[PDB]
Amino acid sequence: GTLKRAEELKTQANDYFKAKDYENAIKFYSQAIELNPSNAIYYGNRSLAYLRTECYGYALGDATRAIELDKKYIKGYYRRAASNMALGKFRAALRDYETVVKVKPNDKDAKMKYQECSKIVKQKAFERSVVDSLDIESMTIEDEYSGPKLEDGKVTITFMKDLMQWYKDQKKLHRKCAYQILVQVKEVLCKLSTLVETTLKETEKITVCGDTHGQFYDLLNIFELNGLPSETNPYIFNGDFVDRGSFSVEVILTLFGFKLLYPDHFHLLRGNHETDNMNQIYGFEGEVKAKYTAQMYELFSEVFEWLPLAQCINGKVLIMHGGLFSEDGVTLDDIRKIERNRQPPDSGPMCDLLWSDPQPQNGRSVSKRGVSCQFGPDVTKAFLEENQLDYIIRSHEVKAEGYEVAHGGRCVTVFSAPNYCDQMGNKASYIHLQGSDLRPQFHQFTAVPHPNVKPMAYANTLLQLG
Ligand SMILES: [Mg+2]
Ligand SMILES: [Mg+2]
């Protein structure tokens, strides 16, 4: 009985979903849909599982299919509005929250989401540089503050070590210090090329980490397990420092501090989560407003805009958060020429560097995330050959073992956030490269305990569904 088979497969998918095994959830929903392609609940649950795995494009299409089947399926509208929020389609989301708060005026949840949506809409409408309406010198550190302070405005190794300790005890760096770090670090970054270039001599090493997503206690574990940064232990943090994790302020100010301390050996590349559309939904903007001000947040936003987009080691390995391009013929010079100081556009090379994913089949598809592309091994081979490169290192996707090697070895994924969001139970890893030998060496590690704060504790409700 085809329909009762579809239904058993959907029940298994629900089971997979609840166990946080979205990849199988998706697969069993997909098979359910294969047997009965005309049920709204199926499309709606698969839309939610695509949302959980940040596949906004696919969540959007499934939500739309669910709504086209049943105009009264309320879930369909929330999950459609979530996808659109994450895609920067704020007005589209509001239309759906409206259609809901309409079909029941009473709903507590409906109006809260509508209002939260309108507030972002209203702000973005509204939307000189923030530093100029700040008077950092005039601020005063209260006598009774006993946490870390800069040594005459300067970051040092002793400041970094006390900062790390202070944060471990869940305490807050005085706002004056936070401001100074931000201003200097803006100054450093705004000097960098869009493409950072590093030469590693025969005897030198470099560590590449992937996403860390505000997992502060895991970030300290990287440093214990692999050493503090210094001029003989350089690091690249390949984006997505913040969001989801509820210690994002602690992660980003530690990283920025180390960038000031070892500016030529501690490198930070922009990820898709160093952007407004992500930060307003996924916790960072809320965490910074809770702990500091809306003005601090606007400053973080403007610094993120100067983060370089890619890094090239010895002209042979190319590192970016996302992946390769929607278009053929993009060169390394083209990347160097990108005007990066902005939010990323909806498409184009800057967008692809932050957002794209590899796919196993040849060619290009519109991406499952609803922005940029998926690119096959023939895309990767042509770009490497055209540019005299050996392979790429990228991050952006959660991996069960903390890394993955795709495209015949030409596309490497590294991911540095173990037990991601307290739920995935994945290993994390970092890479060592060596000047004499640029083949990636992987080191895996597991999650470490942290205080009682939930992931997304500071985020609005727009992307917390189910
Ligand atoms: Mg990412
Ligand atoms: Mg990420």
Author numbering: 23 to 149, 159 to 497
From the paper:
Protein phosphatase 5 (PP5) is an evolutionary conserved serine/threonine phosphatase. Its dephosphorylation activity modulates a diverse set of cellular factors including protein kinases and the microtubule-associated tau protein involved in neurodegenerative disorders. The phosphatase activity of PP5 is regulated in a complex activation mechanism by its N-terminal Hsp90-interacting tetratricopeptide repeat (TPR) domain and its C-terminal α-helix, called αJ-helix. The C-terminal αJ-helix binds to the N-terminal TPR domain of PP5 and locks the enzyme in a latent state.
For the most promising compound crystallographic comparisons of the apo PP5 and the PP5–P5SA-2 complex indicate a relaxation of the auto-inhibited state of PP5. By contrast, a tilting of the TPR domain up to 10° is observed in the ligand complexed structure (RMSD: 0.84 Å) accompanied by a rearrangement of the αJ helix. These structural domain reorganizations are manifested in a reduction in the crystal lattice constant c by 15 Å. Inspecting the omit maps for both αJ helices ranging from Asn491 to Gly497 or to Met498 respectively, a considerable displacement of the Cα-atom of Gly497 by 6.5 Å is observed. Comparing the structures of the human and rat apo PP5 proteins, we observe a similar positioning of the αJ-helix in both, whereas the TPR domain of the human PP5 is even further tilted relative to the rat PP5–P5SA-2 structure. This tilting of the domains and the changes in the αJ helix could well be the reason for the higher activity in the presence of P5SA-2. The ligand P5SA-2 itself cannot be modelled in the F0-Fc electron density map. However comparison of the two structures, PP5 apo and the PP5–P5SA-2 complex, assigns a potential binding site of the ligand at the interface between the TPR and the phosphatase domain. The visible parts of the ligand structure imply interactions with the phosphatase domain at amino acids Glu428, Val429, Lys430, Ala431, Glu435, Met455 and Asn457. The modulate character of the P5SA-2 interaction would be in agreement with the NMR data of this complex, which suggested that parts of the ligand are not complexed by the protein. Substitution of the involved amino acids M455-G456-N457 to A455-G456-A457 and E428-V429-K430 to A428-A429-A430 resulted in loss of the stimulatory potential of the compound P5SA-2, implying that this pocket is indeed involved in regulatory processes, which are altered by the compound.
